[PDB]
Structure formats: C-alpha cells, structure tokens
Amino acid sequence: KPTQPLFPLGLETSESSNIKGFNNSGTIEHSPGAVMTFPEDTEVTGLPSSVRYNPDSDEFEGYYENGGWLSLGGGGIRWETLPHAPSSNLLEGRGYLINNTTGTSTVVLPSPTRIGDSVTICDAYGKFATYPLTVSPSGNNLYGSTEDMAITTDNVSATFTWSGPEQGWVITSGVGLGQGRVYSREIFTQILASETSAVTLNTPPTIVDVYADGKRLAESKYSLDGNVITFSPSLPASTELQVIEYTPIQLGNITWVYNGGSAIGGETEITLDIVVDDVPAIDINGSRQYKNLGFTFDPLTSKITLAQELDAEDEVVVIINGTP
Amino acid sequence: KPTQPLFPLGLETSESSNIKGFNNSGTIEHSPGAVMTFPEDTEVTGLPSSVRYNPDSDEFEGYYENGGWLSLGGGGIRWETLPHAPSSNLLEGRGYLINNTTGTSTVVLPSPTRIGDSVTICDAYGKFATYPLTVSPSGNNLYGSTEDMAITTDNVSATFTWSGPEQGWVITSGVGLGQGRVYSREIFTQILASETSAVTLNTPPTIVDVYADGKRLAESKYSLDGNVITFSPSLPASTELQVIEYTPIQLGNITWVYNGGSAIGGETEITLDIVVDDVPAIDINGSRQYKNLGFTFDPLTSKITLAQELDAEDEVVVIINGTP
Amino acid sequence: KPTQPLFPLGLETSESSNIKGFNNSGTIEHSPGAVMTFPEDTEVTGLPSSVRYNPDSDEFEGYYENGGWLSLGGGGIRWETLPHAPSSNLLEGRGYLINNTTGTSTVVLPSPTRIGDSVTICDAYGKFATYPLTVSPSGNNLYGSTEDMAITTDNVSATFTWSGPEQGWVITSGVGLGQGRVYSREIFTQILASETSAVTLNTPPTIVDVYADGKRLAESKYSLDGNVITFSPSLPASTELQVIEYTPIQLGNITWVYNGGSAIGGETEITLDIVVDDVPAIDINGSRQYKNLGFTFDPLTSKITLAQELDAEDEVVVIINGTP
C-alpha cells in the first residue's frame, strides 16, 4: 500500500531543496527572511486558483474560472508622468499625467485584447483649453467612429474602456469632461500679413476652433457669423492662424440675426437656415415677443409665423432653444 | 533535542510529495513548467497574510488585518457585455456595457454584504436619452430612498457604491451624469386615435417625461403648460403615449405667463403658484423691468410688488432665477 | 555528481516541516484545510515575481519589474465610514463616506510617497451645499497651490491623485463636481443684533460665500452688489454671520447696473470695472440693443461705444458673456 517514504514528524532542511511539486494539507508559514515567488508563464491554458507572474506584461495574474488569466483582485491604475512628445503610445492599465504647458500633443490608444481594457489620461497642469490633447483610437473606432478626438477642457481626467469593436473605446470614468471635438477639416490656413480684426472663409462652416501659433483661442475671443470670423481683440501680423471645422461629442448632461438687422417689412414668414429645436422668443427693435402669443414657430419647416406685417427698417433678433 | 530528520544539503524529489505544511526560512523559486495554486476556502476566520481563491465568488482574496478577507490589492472592475433583457441582476465588482439601442431596460443591484460593494454600468451605445436605463436598489434604498431611478442621459457611465443601509447605494464615479429621474406616477396612458398637437391631464403635474411607443421624447419636442402638454411636432394616430411625473435627483453641479398674456390692469401684486428662488426680471409688452428698480419681489410670499398700476390688455412675462 | 538525497516517488510528511526554501518544478496543489501565507517584509530590495504581505501597510504587494513593490493587480478603493470630526487624517488607498449632516468638516490628505497615491471622499448624505467639506493638502500643493479647498456641491464624490510636488494633488475621478472654493479671507464676522436685510463690507469683494451659524447659505438667498450684501429673506437677530472671499477652481466643462439705473445723458462711453469677456446686449429702459448693431464694445478697454447720446433719467442694463 504505502506509495512513498513517510516522515511522521516532518523533516528539517538546511539548504534549498529541488521539489517536483506537492499536494499540501497543512499551513505554509514563513520566517523572517523568507522570500517567496510566483512562477513565470505566458499561456492561455490554466485552472482556477492557479496564480502567476507575467514577465511579458509585468502583471501578477490569477486564473479566474470564467475568463482564465486576469490581474489579481480585478485591476487598478498604474500612474506615470508622460514626457511631452508630439506623439506617445499608451499601454493598457497605465494612467498618464500629461503636461501640455508647452503645446498640443497626441496620445495613441493601444490595440485592445480584452473587453474592459482601460487607459487613463489627466491634464495635470490644467492646459487642455489652450493646448488640446488629441486621443487616437488608431484604426479601431472611438464612440462608434475611427476619427481621432481632442479634449479642449483643462483639468479634465478620463478613462477610456474597450466596449468591443462596434462602439470601440468609450469613456467610463472622468472629471471636467465638456464637448469632445472631432476635427473634420483645416478649412483655413494663413501666416497673417497685417493686424487682423476678421477673416472670410471659402465656405460657411457649422462650428469652428481657432488656433494662433498652435494655441487654441477661447470662444470668447472670436465670433463666426455666416462665413466671417471676427477677432476681439485682433491678432498681430506674423501669426500662424488655423481655423478647424469639428463635430461635437456630448459627454456632460444662440441668437439669430435677420437681414443684418434690416426689416424688409410687411412679411409674416422668417426661415432659419439651421432646423432649430425651439424658438421661445424674438426681440423686435428692443421689444421681446413670446412664442404662442406674439408668434407661432414651426420646427420642421424652420418658419416663424409673425402675427403682424413688418415695418421697413426694424431690427429683429431670434432666441434659439435658450436656457429652457 | 533534535525533533525530526535533518537534511543539511536539502533533498531533491522527482514526483509530487504530500506535505502537511512547513515553516519556510528560504527562497521559494520556480522552474519553467512550475504551476502554483492557492487553497480553496469560504470562511470568515483567518490570519493576516493568509491568501485564498474563493470558489463561490471566483475572486482571489487575501486576509487583511482590519476586515479579514478582501480582494488582493483592493479591487478593480470586471467588464462584460450585457444581453439586452427587460431585466437583469448585476453582481458586485462587475461592470456592464449596456445596449439600449432596442429599447428601455432595467438592472437590479445585488444584495449588499460589505461597505464599498460596487457595480458599474455604461451606456456604451449612447442610447439612454431615448431608451432610459432604470436602476433598482431592490428593497434597499438608493440616495436614502427605495425608489427605482432612471438615467436618461446617453453615454453616461456610473459606479454605484454601498454606503450602508441608511443612504444605501450612492454613485461614487461616473461620466455624463445629469438629472436622475424618480418616476412617481404614470399620470397619463393612451393609444392615440388621431394626430395629436396637445393632450389635457387629469391634474396639473410638477414635471413630466413623455414616451411614444416606449421611446422617451426629448424636452425640445413637447411643452407642459398648466395641465396641457403641447407637441411640436405632433404625434401620429396609433401611437402608444405615456406621460410620467418624476422627481429629479441632482448630480452635476424658466418663464412665467400671467393670465395668458392678458393684463387685468391697475394691480401691483402678482402671485406665483410655485415658491420661486429668485425673479431677476419681468418683461412687460416687450420691455424688460429689473428687480429693485422697476419692481420688488418677496420670495416666501411669492408676490411681485409692481411699482405702477397695470394697463388693460398688456403682456407680462416673468424670468425665474435664470442664468444668475 | 549527486549533490543531495533523491526521493524518486516524492515523500509524504505528517507534521509541519521546516524547509530553507526550494526551486519547485511541479504543481503546488492544496487539500481541504490547506491554509497558505505570504512572508512579512518592509524593504525596497526585491526581484520580479517576489510577492509579500506588508504588515506596516496591511497591503498584499508584489514586486513589479519597473517600480518594485506595488499592490497586487494595480490597486482599488478601500471604503470605510468616517466619524464626523472637525478634522480627520485620511490614508492612501482608502475611500471615506463623509457625514456632514451635523455641520462642516475638514479632511487632511496624507504625505504622498508615490506618483498615483490616491484618496477618495464622498458626500454620502448629500450635505456639502450646506455643510462644505474642506480638503487640506497639508504643506504640499493642490492644483499647483498649498491652499486648502472646499467642496460645496452635495452628493459629490472625488478621487485625489498625487501628480508629484509641482502641481500636487489633482482630482482624477469624481461625480457632481462644480466650482471648488479657495477661501482667501473671512472679510466679515458678526453676531447680528437685529433682523438683517443687508450688511455693508469694509471693501468691495470679488465673489463671496455666506455662512449663518456655520451653515453655508445658497447664492439664491443673498446678493452682493458693490460692497453691500442683501438678504432675501432676512436673517434673525443672534445669528452667527460670516462672509468669505474665495477664488473658484473650475472642474466641470451676469448683469451690470450703470449709475443705479440713472442715465447721465448725452454720453457714448460706458466703462465696466471688471475686464469683461463679452457684452452681447444692453437693455435700455426695457429695450434690448445688440452688439455690432446698436453698439460696439472693446474688451481690453472695457468701454461700451454707444451709437447715440443718452437721455436724462434712462435705465441701462448690460449682459456680460451670457449663455453664448
């Protein structure tokens, strides 16, 4: 019956043994000095409770019933400073303190390998309003599209999480998040030759960011009306000016000028080029008129049905879905 | 004196031994192939540094001095896709990518067992504005109440954390969070028989969500004035219409019409049904009047003290605590 | 050649052995009852895959290639209730459910030791609007300054993360975050002797919080115009009143009165004491005028260039960069 030697009081050992494994039935304790290790291993095969150190990935993984290998007790963020570079590849599980004090920069998300793959960035210096961070999903999509995205709010922090290839990276956690920007086209470029109050574009744009010598200008500092950008204050000669059309991406949770403030007169219909959500009120020559009293507005048609005929040389201003 | 056999150069072993434990005083190393395991165990008793694999819970726990058993190096999020179901039980420590593309859905929070028990959800498809997610604390309260809560902002992500039974689940982490809704009553139900510009309610409601064929309508598309909801645009015949009273729950960080725009005349007192926070201004027939100049308003009394007598057939509009 | 005793079928042991380590080449398994331990150790020296229990820190650390010792599978949050105290030291890696139901309180961030050191707080009771939480970076700076910060939004949750000493603690994760306050000066103190509609300050302040018997008053309840605070409603005699100047700190993502509503007449220039971002419109005696039609405004100069001479006894109100 007995398969192997039996040591009823156990055994002491005074140098390192070389043991091909054991089923243990008692307490594994340690003494001062006792160092202890996990085996190196990069393989998919495993059994629940098996634990390892991954030398490739530098992560202590255990092998969980459903989903095999994974980091021990879920995961957590590995913070590091990021040298300001024009471009930087990030790794799953890290967090990057970004310093855009010097200018804009780009980070490139890693190839996703698992649902829940995560990368955290942070405007540690509060500089993204003026020097946006561009985030690149490489060829995989971000919010259902492969378009790069820029974060133009300073002090914003954000965890990107892989939802799978259909919607791709989505932000699961963050602070400070306003409108993401998806820049479509650099629709104006110019080394300004004189002091510049305004510039005219080749096309009326939807909505634009403006960049002076690679520094994003705040929306308070310029105004886009039709196809002219006006600059308050002006910009000096020699300035590297860029205008960039973009599509907003909403994370967190409007005035119309008719005929340059000139009233055609005896008209009941105003048509707004943009289909508008709502028109609560219209200011006429410093007098406010309210919807379903002074006027009727049809949303699909974008047509304001005026109650009475206009006079000649009146000033008309429209409020569009404002602080409802 | 010697208690057991001594092996001064250690021992080699060529098959698995069967060892009832040992105090180890040297380096436990491994060779290629070396697999290593933690013991299975679901018990409360433990000693600091004891480590285990929990087979019930599928989590690698260590036993920490204060609070015994816990996940190794705190925790972290276990992401998984969630099949769109009308209802779904979630587990502590998981995160759920939700797909509400097809319609609304409900998730039910687990029984809490420990302070800091956490569950993460995510509108991965940006669909909660139109197909809200309802979150259920089962019988335990959420923000101090056992009422279910709905998230109607798309692209929102949110970690719910157990604070104990008094306040219950609270969101500790998230992105996109606007107003939670706590639906009190389905105050109107109807299969519409004609095209519908408006509907009258059995009661004037405080604030309402509207649902057409189980899809939540945006606040831009309808207006609730007194006890009539008006619809811009209209809704087709056959539509499954629902109106739902709810109480907001504020996470992140207003016009009054008097006598249907008809002035009674020679009056100095306007009373606002809702007690109002503040009344900066009143528009009278397209002329704005400012508080503590044109008028005096008392907040508890909700009474606007007009400086001069009203004329007959004037239009009066009040601004209530607007963009201060 | 043979260095030590060879046991070709392994060995059984019936009591605890005392082994000075081994290179293991096979499966370490366990039986029911098998308890297993990591060695205690608080030292910087280590080799990749070495694992330990830290008795000082109560954390199960592994030794990662780059950065040696660290919590196993990154980290995660250790939630605990916080006894309401006037002041409380927090520990790295914990999260604190705060109860400010009873009144304001202060938490003090720990000495940072590693980039990514993190502490989470949470207004579990939704009480910070009325009883702000003050956060102290001790002598280290927070957002580049050593000034304490107060959170006055209820239901806010927030993780503070060490970015290194230059910018110091930054919030990397959170919910509900509005304007941080950095209180500079208690610029008014008084036990009120009568019912109080208003109080006059020794200095015109920029922006102020107000506290009645240690409870922060909501901005709806009082108004600061020039150097007079007006109170709507009033405050009872015996009230412990405090006014506090502060500088906002923006995380998430305006009316000017000229000569007390009295028009000097025949003037084209209005100068605004604060340099203003933008002035879209000016209300004159209940008539709105729009920028670049009715008027021209220069931002650096803060000068409104009126088109026509003022009349005597007119009312002028200015809109400053409002809901653009």
Numbering used by the authors:
A (entry chain A), B (entry chain A), C (entry chain A): 4 to 256, 265 to 335
From the manuscript:
The 335 N-terminal residues of TSP4 promote the assembly of the TSP complex and anchor it to the tail baseplate.
TSP4-N335 crystals grown in KNa-tartrate solution diffracted to the highest resolution. Subsequently, the three resolved SeMet-TSP4-N335 domains were used as search models for molecular replacement with diffraction data from the wild-type protein crystals grown in KNa-tartrate. The resulting electron density map enabled tracing of the XD3 domains. TSP4-N335 associates into an elongated trimer, ~ 115 Å in length and ~ 65 Å at its widest region. A monomeric subunit comprises four domains; AD, XD1, XD2 and XD3. The XD2 and XD3 domains share the same threefold symmetry axis as the AD and XD1 domains such that three XD2 domains splay apart and do not interact with one another whereas the three XD3 domains pack together around the threefold symmetry axis. The separated XD2 modules lack continuous surface for binding a trimeric partner TSP, which is unlikely to represent the physiological structure. In contrast, the three TSP4 -N335 XD3 modules pack closely, with the adjacent N- and C-termini placed within a face perpendicular to the threefold symmetry axis. The third linker connects the TSP4 XD2 and XD3 domains by a glycine-rich flexible long polypeptide (Thr250-Pro-Ile-Gln-Leu-Gly-Asn-Gly-Gly-Gly-Ser-Gly-Ser-Ser-Thr264) that is structurally disordered as manifested by the lack of associated interpretable electron density maps for both the wild-type and SeMet TSP4-N335 crystal structures.
